[PDB]
């Protein structure tokens, strides 16, 4: 099956060898223990977390606002534990999930601050030569949450 060296002797991309699962499980356990020790020692900076609230995924740091287009039916200033965090990160590590992370592992919390109504949004249809013209003033309900604390637990 030997082929001499030509142009199309081989594909252009470099063949990368996959090492054996023995040493790869060695590497995986080593890196995991290092990261878990960093967490136990509390060696991270601040955290961000990709979080799947209302239907859209928000890249959420600590202490910052998020506007949501529905009414959550919660009285204002109320604390919430957002589950469905699906990526977390610091400077020196990130701990992403398949697809979600552990509810025992990452803790994301947020207060409902305000429930307003949005700006008056115009809906307008018009067909030419056909006397078609219809206006409508839609104005959706909205809330705003404050992300307080993305604290992380060392349960890897």
């Amino acid at each position: 099956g030997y082929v001499p060296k030509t142009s199309l002797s081989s594909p252009p991309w470099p063949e990368v060898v996959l090492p054996d699962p023995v040493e790869e499980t060695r590497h995986h356990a080593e890196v995991v223990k290092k990261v878990n020790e960093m967490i136990v020692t509390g060696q991270y900076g601040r955290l961000f977390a990709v979080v799947h609230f209302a239907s859209r995924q928000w890249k959420v740091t600590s202490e910052d606002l998020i506007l949501i287009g529905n009414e959550l039916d919660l009285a204002c200033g109320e604390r919430i534990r957002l589950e469905k965090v699906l990526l977390v990160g610091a400077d020196n590590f990130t701990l992403l999930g398949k697809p979600l992370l552990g509810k025992d592992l990452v803790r994301v919390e947020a207060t409902v601050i305000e429930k307003t109504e949005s700006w008056p949004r115009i809906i307008m249809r018009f067909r030419k030569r056909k006397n078609f013209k219809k206006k409508r003033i839609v104005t959706t309900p909205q809330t705003v949450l404050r992300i307080n604390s993305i604290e992380i637990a060392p349960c890897l």
């Binding site: 991270y44 900076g45 601040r46 202490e63 610091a90 400077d91 307080n148 604390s149």
Partner: peptide, 10 residues
């Protein structure tokens, strides 16, 4: 007192 510092514990 960088940008990454552990945010305040309210």
């Amino acid at each position: 007192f960088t940008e990454n510092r552990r945010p305040w514990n309210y």
